[PDB]
Design a protein around this ligand. Structure first.
Ligand code: CLA
Ligand code: CLA
Ligand code: CLA
Ligand code: CLA
Ligand code: CLA
Ligand code: CLA
Ligand code: CLA
Ligand SMILES: CC(=O)O[C@H]1CC(C)(C)C(=C=C/C(C)=C/C=C/C(C)=C/C=C/C=C(C)/C=C/C=C(\C)C(=O)C[C@@]23O[C@]2(C)C[C@@H](O)CC3(C)C)[C@](C)(O)C1
Ligand SMILES: CC(=O)O[C@H]1CC(C)(C)C(=C=C/C(C)=C/C=C/C(C)=C/C=C/C=C(C)/C=C/C=C(\C)C(=O)C[C@@]23O[C@]2(C)C[C@@H](O)CC3(C)C)[C@](C)(O)C1
Ligand code: KC2
Ligand SMILES: CC1=C(C#C/C(C)=C/C=C/C(C)=C/C=C/C=C(C)/C=C/C=C(C)/C=C/[C@@]23O[C@]2(C)C[C@@H](O)CC3(C)C)C(C)(C)C[C@H](O)C1
Lengths: 205, 194, 138
């Protein structure tokens, strides 16, 4: 649906709000429709990644940790070490683990760009295509591998997507609040309990 | 004059085209289009130059080194006066900066087929070089009247900027020009490109 | 003779501002600079004057290709006195002020010939540059 209608199903009070005017932009001389699709798919990607980041930060900072080991060869584990903060756990992971995680996410991103109609060229922003026609690889779909979300009938699905966009935006704000309280003292009134350091965070390796 | 439909009439001199020496009348509409393109180029270069001069005076610089071969850090170069900064840039760096600028200028004259010195002039029009001007579409939110106001503000700011850049460049070199007693940075008022 | 008059006037009205402002200003870092033109040309390296002369000769030869004699030049009826075609900004398309600009070019060129002659000979008389020689009169 249109920009005004979307921003009005997301928040009637605020309504459409775009000081930068990127919704009318023309990235790469592709066209306003394609560029609006690109912008919508990024927000949904940022929101999804941010919600996952928040729940992961919450789960792994408290102390929950997997038992099936990572380094291999009967070697001590750096990330499983005291109440280490999650960015420092990521740093403490070995380089091979980080590279392969990033490459797996890269394959997921490549498949999202590849399968199905593209979000820019008349495709739904945020739909993950189905893992089909890949030779010698049959895997559950990334979205709903169990498929227990059939029956919304396209009446509740759009409102659920609006809730996703919201929750995603709030998750971006929350996780960056965590990082800013962590690497800038006093950035948030709460979150002072977070440790004073993380690392560069914007540097994976 | 020939300069009535052109979009540069200010509110400070009044709503009459300030052409006291009548240079707009002398020449063709192609000549006046060349004048407008030159004015807008000088405006844009002067805005960028004044921002660069402020950056150089402040001392903020990129983290890194200009050349891994030559011992020229941005920290090292920031200690000189603004024009000796360019004098201290490496020769190859200056050469490729000028190469990029010249490529941009040649393509501006080439690929924008309805030329400024031609019918359907569009003198300062460099949009057409795709993704060069406003790659992010910031002005795309603006209507016709707002665009006209922004263009007038462009010309006003750039005119002031090209006055100011020359002012700061000459104020220390010839003392007493600018009445203010602020101690402008030393150094040349003019640098040869290589 | 109008082709010569215009050529001489153009050379002289490039020379006179050059002679008068080379005392005040220097090309940044140039060697052999002197404020007065005569010892300036004496001191400047010969392979700079040679390149200037080569530039002028290249322009003259390419502009006057196959037309260097009184008949060969102006053999073409269109070819006008001094109309070498150098007008990048196209002031000549406006034909209302063409006569004004032509007369102004002619008068300014003539005045520049006389002015450059005066500057050079005053420098010969005094041994000092143009502005110094002038300001030591009053
Ligand atoms: C390593 C492999 C890999 C690959 C191939 C991609 C591919 C993509 N990602 Mg990225 N992404 C990756 C890993 C990867 N991602 C990881 C590990 C994460 C963290 C979860 C993300 C999180 C992420 C987000 C949140 C977004 C992207 C987006 C993009 C686009 C990149 C455009 C860009 O700026 O180019 C690189 C250009 C440069 C100038 C270099 C920058 C350094 C494209 C779909 C954007 C997208 O899809 O927008 C529609 C987007 O919004 N990615
Ligand atoms: C705007 C914020 C930001 C900042 C401050 C940094 C800072 C940094 N990034 Mg970058 N980075 C950013 C955004 C940012 N990144 C984004 C959005 C992405 C995803 C496309 C990346 C992806 C990325 C990678 C893959 C790598 C860096 C690396 C680096 C380092 C650059 C110098 C170097 O060694 O090379 C430095 C820690 C490099 C590094 O040394 O990391 C430790 C490196 O390998 N960054
Ligand atoms: C080199 C830069 C430059 C250029 C190319 C132009 C060009 C133009 N200006 Mg001008 N202008 C400039 C700088 C420049 N301006 C500056 C710095 C100011 C003072 C802040 C102004 C203030 C100004 C006003 C207020 C107006 C114009 C206007 C114009 C246009 C018509 C007059 C004309 O024919 O001028 C042709 C001019 C030249 C070819 C420049 C040659 C200048 C001489 C040779 C040297 C000057 C030396 C200097 C005093 C030291 C024309 C497009 C009018 C306009 O836009 O009408 C629609 C108009 O109203 N200009
Ligand atoms: C007339 C324009 C102009 C010129 C001739 C120079 C010249 C110079 N700058 Mg640059 N600079 C400019 C504008 C200019 N600057 C502007 C507008 C900014 C603000 C973004 C900067 C910010 C800047 C920094 C932070 C540093 C330099 C430095 C330098 C030196 C090395 C070249 C370089 O790194 O360029 C860099 C060129 C740019 C960053 C962009 C130039 C402007 C483009 C056309 C528009 C903006 C593009 C993009 C959106 C940002 C050299 C003396 C270095 C130095 O000596 O520091 C002491 C240095 O570290 N400049
Ligand atoms: C690298 C090579 C290069 C190339 C090919 C060009 C090409 C051009 N420049 Mg230049 N220009 C360059 C570097 C280059 N520029 C750089 C590094 C800058 C940044 C400072 C500029 C800033 C600049 C301005 C501000 C203007 C030009 C103009 C011009 C035109 C020729 C003017 C002329 O004949 O002047 C001969 C006479 C001289 C005094 C020199 C043409 C589009 C003019 C133009 O387009 O006018 C419409 C113009 O006004 N250029
Ligand atoms: C008859 C013409 C003439 C001649 C023969 C010379 C000869 C000389 N000049 Mg130059 N000079 C001239 C005119 C001339 N000048 C003019 C008009 C000026 C501007 C005031 C200067 C300013 C000048 C300075 C500041 C210096 C010299 C110096 C010199 C000497 C070394 C060469 C050099 O560095 O040139 C430098 C040349 C210039 C800075 C620019 C020359 C301008 C040309 C002739 C204009 C023609 C191009 C045209 C306008 C462009 C058309 C554009 C169109 C396509 C749009 C040499 C004796 C140096 C000296 O003093 O050595 C003792 C020196 O430092 N000259
Ligand atoms: C644009 C043309 C021009 C101008 C403005 C000047 C100006 C000057 N020349 Mg002359 N001069 C010129 C062309 C010019 N000259 C030419 C073409 C030559 C080459 C023959 C000379 C050769 C020359 C020499 C050899 C000398 C001058 C000198 C002078 C100065 C004193 C003249 C005087 O007292 O006259 C006084 C004349 C009158 C009061 C009577 C004439 C008045 C009626 C109305 C005309 C003066 C600055 C002298 C100088 O340098 O003095 C310091 C000097 O020695 N000039
Ligand atoms: C300081 C002060 O004063 O204030 C503040 C400042 C500050 C920093 C902002 C604060 C914070 C943090 C905040 C606000 C953090 C917010 C985080 C947020 C908002 C995190 C959402 C995650 C959602 C997930 C993972 C959902 C997955 C959901 C999945 C995978 C689904 O299955 C969805 C589903 O639709 C399908 C696909 C199928 C349908 O059948 C229906 C269901 C539901 C099953 C504080 C602490 O509050 C303090
Ligand atoms: C009296 C005395 O003695 O001294 C006085 C006078 C004297 C001598 C003149 C002095 C001086 C110097 C002066 C006054 C210098 C002035 C310099 C000046 C005026 C410099 C402008 C730069 C502008 C830039 C770079 C803008 C870029 C802007 C860009 C690229 C935009 O995108 C604009 C944008 O709109 C679009 C296109 C679309 C919108 O959607 C978004 C925004 C809004 C972002 C003194 C010494 O200071 C004080
Ligand atoms: C204006 C924009 C600009 C562009 C678009 C651009 C693009 C590329 C590309 C891609 C096509 C490559 C592959 C490349 C490579 C190198 N660039 Mg380069 N470059 C630009 C600007 C400068 C400046 C200002 C300097 C510079 C340099 C170097 C050196 C170091 C050499 C060395 O250490 O000797 C290397 C290897 C420095 C230099 O040459 O220093 C003497 C230096 O100062 N570049 N550059
Ligand atoms: C062709 C063309 C173009 C052009 C052009 C250009 C570059 C034009 C340049 C013109 C130029 C540069 C013209 C100088 C005149 C100088 C004169 C008359 C000097 C008199 C000097 C005199 C009378 C001096 C006299 C004295 O010194 C004497 C003798 C004795 C001393 O004691 C002191 C005094 C002062 C008394 C465009 C615009 C670039 C493109 C377009 O397409 C068309």
């Amino acid at each position: 649906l249109t920009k005004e209608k979307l921003a009005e199903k997301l928040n009637p009070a605020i309504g459409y709000y775009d000081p930068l005017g990127l919704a009318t932009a023309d990235f790469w001389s592709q066209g306003n429709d394609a560029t609006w699709g690109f912008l919508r798919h990024s927000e949904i990607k940022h929101g999804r990644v941010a919600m996952a980041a928040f729940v992961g930060f919450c789960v792994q900072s408290n102390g929950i940790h997997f038992p099936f080991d990572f380094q291999g060869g009967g070697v001590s584990q750096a990330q499983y070490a005291a109440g280490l903060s999650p960015p420092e756990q990521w740093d403490a992971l070995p380089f091979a683990a980080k590279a392969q995680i990033i490459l797996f996410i890269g394959f997921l991103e490549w498949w999202s760009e590849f399968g199905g109609q593209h979000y820019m060229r008349g495709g739904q922003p945020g739909k993950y295509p189905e893992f089909k026609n890949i030779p010698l690889h049959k895997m559950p779909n990334l979205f709903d591998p169990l498929g227990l979300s059939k029956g919304l009938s396209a009446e509740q699905r759009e409102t659920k997507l609006c809730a996703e966009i919201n929750n995603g935006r709030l998750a971006m704000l929350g996780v960056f609040g965590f990082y800013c309280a962590e690497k800038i003292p006093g950035s948030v009134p709460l979150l002072s309990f977070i440790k004073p350091y993380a690392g560069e965070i914007m540097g994976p390796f | 004059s020939a300069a009535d439909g052109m979009e540069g009439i200010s509110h400070e001199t009044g709503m009459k085209t300030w052409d006291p020496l009548g240079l707009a009348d002398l020449g063709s509409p192609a000549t006046l289009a060349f004048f407008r393109h030159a004015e807008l180029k000088h405006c844009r270069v002067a805005m960028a130059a004044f921002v660069g001069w402020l950056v150089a005076v402040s001392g903020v610089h990129f983290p890194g080194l200009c050349s891994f071969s030559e011992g020229v850090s941005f920290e090292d170069i920031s200690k000189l006066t603004p024009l000796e900064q360019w004098a201290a840039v490496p020769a190859l760096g200056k050469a490729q900066i000028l190469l990029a600028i010249g490529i941009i200028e040649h393509n501006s004259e080439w690929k924008i087929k309805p030329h400024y010195m031609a019918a359907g002039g569009k003198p300062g029009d460099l949009k057409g070089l795709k993704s060069f001007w406003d790659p992010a579409g910031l002005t795309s939110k603006m209507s016709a009247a707002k665009l006209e106001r922004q263009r007038l503000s462009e010309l006003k700011n750039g005119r002031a900027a090209m006055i100011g850049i020359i002012s700061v460049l000459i104020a220390h070199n010839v003392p007493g020009s600018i009445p203010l007693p602020i101690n402008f940075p030393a150094g040349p008022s003019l640098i040869l490109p290589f | 003779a109008r082709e010569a008059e215009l050529k001489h006037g153009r050379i002289c009205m490039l020379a006179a501002p050059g002679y008068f402002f080379q005392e005040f200003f220097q090309l940044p870092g140039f060697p052999g600079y002197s404020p007065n033109g005569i010892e300036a040309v004496s001191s400047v390296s010969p392979e700079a004057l040679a390149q200037i002369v080569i530039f002028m000769s290249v322009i003259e030869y390419n502009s006057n290709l196959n037309k260097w004699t009184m008949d060969t030049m102006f053999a073409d009826p269109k070819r006008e006195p001094g109309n070498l075609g150098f007008d990048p900004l196209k002031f000549g398309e406006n034909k209302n002020t063409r006569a004004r600009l032509e007369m102004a070019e002619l008068k300014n060129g003539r005045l520049a010939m006389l002015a450059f002659s005066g500057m050079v000979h005053q420098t010969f008389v005094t041994g000092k540059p143009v502005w110094a020689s002038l300001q030591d009169i009053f």
